[PDB]
């Protein structure tokens, strides 16, 4: 306490209030998207940013506005200015570019976009906890798709099982 910006993964406009815990993949699979079905064409959302947090896997990323950040008193604020300055610099250098340049930028960015989504999925469970929740779930050491083992981390047993039961059944299956 308190939390720290590690990396800005993305940028969007969405429903005002569609920020925070309710905005994780797990929260969203369980309960639905607070940004439900947001047409740029409900009252303009706000500029919202997808945040990757210090000491927390990508599974736990949240969408946050300049204001929630300031509100939640997080550290790494400097990084919101660079992200913006940098975002502006890109746009300016791409106002007039071939359609080729613009084409390249959209593929070469769909690539990453998709890449980053993989960090949120477990490609292998490698260890579990000797202690268990009251519900009787152990925690799992997870190997995430797309990232080195130095990025493995311990995920809540219930959290995982909701989506990666297969990885779980498979880990125990290899005994």
């Amino acid at each position: 306490e308190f939390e720290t910006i590690e990396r800005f993964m993305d940028c969007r406009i969405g429903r005002k209030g569609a920020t925070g815990a309710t905005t994780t993949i797990y929260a969203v699979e369980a309960d639905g998207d607070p940004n439900a079905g947001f047409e740029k064409n409900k009252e303009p959302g706000e500029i919202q940013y997808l945040i990757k947090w210090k000491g927390w896997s990508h599974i736990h990323n949240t969408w946050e506005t300049e204001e929630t950040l300031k509100q939640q008193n997080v550290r790494g604020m400097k990084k919101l200015d660079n992200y913006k300055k940098k975002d502006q610099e890109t746009k300016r250098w791409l106002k007039n570019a071939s359609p080729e340049d613009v084409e390249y930028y959209n593929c070469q960015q769909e690539l990453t976009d998709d890449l980053h989504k993989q960090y949120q999925i477990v490609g292998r469970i490698i260890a579990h906890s000797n202690q268990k929740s009251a519900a009787g779930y152990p925690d799992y050491y997870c190997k995430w798709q797309g990232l080195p083992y130095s990025e493995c981390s311990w995920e809540d047993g219930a959290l995982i099982s909701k989506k990666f039961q297969a990885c779980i059944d498979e880990y125990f299956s290899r005994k």
């Binding site: 815990a21 994780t24 797990y26 929260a27 736990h60 809540d156 959290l159």
Partner: peptide, 6 residues
Amino acid sequence: ARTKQT
């Protein structure tokens, strides 16, 4: 342990 499961 530790989720955001508000």
